Design a protein around this motif. Structure first.
Motif, PDB file in Angstrom:
ATOM      1  N   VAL A 168     -49.279 -30.380 -13.253  1.00  0.00           N
ATOM      2  CA  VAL A 168     -50.051 -30.227 -12.320  1.00  0.00           C
ATOM      3  C   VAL A 168     -50.345 -27.798 -11.579  1.00  0.00           C
ATOM      4  N   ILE A 169     -51.464 -27.863 -11.781  1.00  0.00           N
ATOM      5  CA  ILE A 169     -51.913 -25.993 -11.340  1.00  0.00           C
ATOM      6  C   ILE A 169     -52.082 -25.716 -10.076  1.00  0.00           C
ATOM      7  N   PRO A 170     -52.114 -25.602  -9.580  1.00  0.00           N
ATOM      8  CA  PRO A 170     -52.603 -24.739  -8.040  1.00  0.00           C
ATOM      9  C   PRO A 170     -53.816 -23.971  -7.519  1.00  0.00           C
ATOM     10  N   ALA A 171     -54.737 -23.890  -8.706  1.00  0.00           N
ATOM     11  CA  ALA A 171     -56.799 -23.771  -8.752  1.00  0.00           C
ATOM     12  C   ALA A 171     -56.500 -24.100 -10.342  1.00  0.00           C
ATOM     13  N   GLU A 172     -57.438 -24.656 -10.375  1.00  0.00           N
ATOM     14  CA  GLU A 172     -59.173 -24.600 -12.231  1.00  0.00           C
ATOM     15  C   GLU A 172     -59.291 -23.014 -12.175  1.00  0.00           C
ATOM     16  N   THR A 173     -58.352 -21.882 -12.891  1.00  0.00           N
ATOM     17  CA  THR A 173     -59.006 -20.668 -12.828  1.00  0.00           C
ATOM     18  C   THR A 173     -58.229 -20.551 -14.539  1.00  0.00           C
ATOM     19  N   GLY A 174     -59.072 -19.007 -14.948  1.00  0.00           N
ATOM     20  CA  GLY A 174     -58.622 -18.694 -15.946  1.00  0.00           C
ATOM     21  C   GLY A 174     -57.429 -18.398 -16.541  1.00  0.00           C
ATOM     22  N   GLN A 175     -56.316 -17.753 -14.949  1.00  0.00           N
ATOM     23  CA  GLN A 175     -55.220 -17.545 -15.092  1.00  0.00           C
ATOM     24  C   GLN A 175     -54.165 -18.933 -15.700  1.00  0.00           C
ATOM     25  N   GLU A 176     -54.048 -19.739 -14.630  1.00  0.00           N
ATOM     26  CA  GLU A 176     -53.886 -20.473 -15.495  1.00  0.00           C
ATOM     27  C   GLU A 176     -53.533 -21.750 -16.332  1.00  0.00           C
ATOM     28  N   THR A 177     -54.833 -21.152 -16.755  1.00  0.00           N
ATOM     29  CA  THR A 177     -55.024 -21.707 -17.998  1.00  0.00           C
ATOM     30  C   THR A 177     -54.960 -20.794 -19.643  1.00  0.00           C
ATOM     31  N   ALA A 178     -55.169 -19.219 -19.353  1.00  0.00           N
ATOM     32  CA  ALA A 178     -54.015 -18.414 -19.936  1.00  0.00           C
ATOM     33  C   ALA A 178     -52.060 -18.552 -20.162  1.00  0.00           C
ATOM     34  N   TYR A 179     -52.040 -18.764 -18.895  1.00  0.00           N
ATOM     35  CA  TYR A 179     -50.761 -18.896 -19.155  1.00  0.00           C
ATOM     36  C   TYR A 179     -50.025 -20.159 -20.195  1.00  0.00           C
ATOM     37  N   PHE A 180     -51.019 -21.074 -19.393  1.00  0.00           N
ATOM     38  CA  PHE A 180     -50.448 -22.369 -20.273  1.00  0.00           C
ATOM     39  C   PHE A 180     -50.811 -22.578 -21.678  1.00  0.00           C
ATOM     40  N   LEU A 181     -51.895 -22.214 -22.088  1.00  0.00           N
ATOM     41  CA  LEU A 181     -51.992 -21.926 -23.724  1.00  0.00           C
ATOM     42  C   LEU A 181     -50.621 -21.126 -24.199  1.00  0.00           C
ATOM     43  N   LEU A 182     -50.425 -19.767 -23.380  1.00  0.00           N
ATOM     44  CA  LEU A 182     -49.102 -19.017 -23.662  1.00  0.00           C
ATOM     45  C   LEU A 182     -48.444 -20.533 -24.361  1.00  0.00           C
ATOM     46  N   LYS A 183     -47.650 -20.759 -22.714  1.00  0.00           N
ATOM     47  CA  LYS A 183     -46.589 -21.471 -23.392  1.00  0.00           C
ATOM     48  C   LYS A 183     -46.450 -22.411 -24.112  1.00  0.00           C
ATOM     49  N   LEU A 184     -47.593 -22.887 -24.397  1.00  0.00           N
ATOM     50  CA  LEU A 184     -47.955 -24.100 -25.616  1.00  0.00           C
ATOM     51  C   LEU A 184     -46.944 -23.781 -27.060  1.00  0.00           C
ATOM     52  N   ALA A 185     -48.350 -22.456 -27.482  1.00  0.00           N
ATOM     53  CA  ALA A 185     -48.324 -21.714 -28.301  1.00  0.00           C
ATOM     54  C   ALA A 185     -47.245 -21.181 -28.869  1.00  0.00           C
ATOM     55  N   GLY A 186     -46.001 -21.074 -27.968  1.00  0.00           N
ATOM     56  CA  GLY A 186     -44.995 -20.974 -28.193  1.00  0.00           C
ATOM     57  C   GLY A 186     -43.913 -22.096 -28.465  1.00  0.00           C
ATOM     58  N   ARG A 187     -43.792 -23.241 -27.890  1.00  0.00           N
ATOM     59  CA  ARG A 187     -43.610 -24.039 -28.141  1.00  0.00           C
ATOM     60  C   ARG A 187     -44.119 -25.196 -29.703  1.00  0.00           C
TER      61      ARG A 187
END
Ligand SMILES: Cc1ccc(-c2c(C)c(-c3ccc4c(c3)NCCO4)c([C@H](OC(C)(C)C)C(=O)O)c(C)c2NS(C)(=O)=O)cc1C
Ligand SMILES: Cc1ccc(-c2c(C)c(-c3ccc4c(c3)NCCO4)c([C@H](OC(C)(C)C)C(=O)O)c(C)c2NS(C)(=O)=O)cc1C
Lengths: 143, 143
Positions: free
Chosen positions: B33-52
């Motif tokens: 769950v993300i607070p809003a549907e923004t680029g910032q959230e997606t960017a952070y998410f991708l960074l987490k995902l890529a690390g894993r």
């Protein structure tokens, strides 16, 4: 050597709290910045982690981290057991911090640097990377 | 079949936004769950995902999700490429929702139910579980 064993701890940087989980056999890590060092954050974190990897037991260097009703509930639901120190080392939190320091200027927010640090640590071959080792350990264990 | 391909989309439930990533070959998922549907959230998410996980390319059902400077930066840094629809199906977002509905009473916050749903989906054998398949796919690909 055991496939399901993880270590979980909080560190601090820049006035902020970073929760770091280590898969002990592999050295693979997941970390994130949490708003405060509370049971609620730890419980949510554990639930995420358990959903993604086989988490059988968790160790910590601060046992009190695990006393909250909230954490107990997440371990109960996900079926995680504690490994008491009642009951070999790490200093990943130093290594992570080192990498965080290296990349810090690449980002505004500390949380961003942390994810960058996790990625870098997980992919660093040196021999497999930790990322490679955890999947190999998990796959072998399965079959 | 390809090891690095992921699909990323937002859904809505209870007035809230859930970001769902699917590893296409395995059906394994990560969602939050993300607070809003923004680029910032997606960017952070991708960074987490890529690390894993090894994230080589990402597809989406809403291409505009990927136009932000912020997302482009995260894909640039992690070295992720887009797969254009310019350029087989899913409905995981329905399946996830189904499981979310089943467990919803077990938790106060929707975010909590989502993590419970992810865990359940990933471990459901039915044959391996998706969790088993992604590691097997990744390990085989390595060696
Ligand atoms: C024109 C412009 C557009 C976006 C950014 C920016 C970027 C590129 C990043 C940014 C995005 C992805 C990245 C990096 C930075 N750094 C390297 C890894 O990938 C970030 C990071 O915050 C989030 C988006 C990750 C939450 C940050 O902490 O620096 C932040 C906070 C940024 N600032 S912004 C736009 O206010 O969110 C900066 C400028 C000058
Ligand atoms: C005495 C008492 C203590 C804790 C909780 C509680 C629990 C157990 C959970 C709770 C913790 C772990 C769980 C579950 C609930 N549900 C199943 C999976 O594991 C949660 C969950 O929120 C967080 C902690 C996950 C952020 C929730 O959304 O329900 C929340 C929000 C709870 N409420 S609390 C204490 O205000 O954070 C309730 C009571 C009555």
């Amino acid at each position: 050597c055991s496939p399901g064993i993880w270590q979980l701890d909080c560190t601090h940087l820049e006035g902020k709290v970073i929760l770091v989980a280590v898969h002990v056999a592999s050295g693979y890590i997941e970390a994130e910045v949490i708003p405060a060092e509370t049971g609620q954050e730890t419980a949510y974190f554990l639930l995420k982690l358990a959903g993604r990897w086989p988490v059988k037991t968790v160790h910590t260097d601060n046992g009190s981290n695990f006393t909250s009703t909230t954490v107990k509930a997440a371990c109960w639901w996900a079926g995680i057991k504690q490994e008491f120190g009642i009951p070999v080392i790490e200093s990943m939190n130093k290594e992570l911090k080192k990498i965080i320091g290296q990349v810090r200027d690449q980002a505004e927010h500390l949380k961003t640097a942390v994810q960058m640090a996790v990625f870098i640590h997980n992919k660093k071959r040196k021999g497999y990377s930790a990322g490679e080792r955890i999947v190999d350990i998990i796959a072998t264990d399965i079959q």
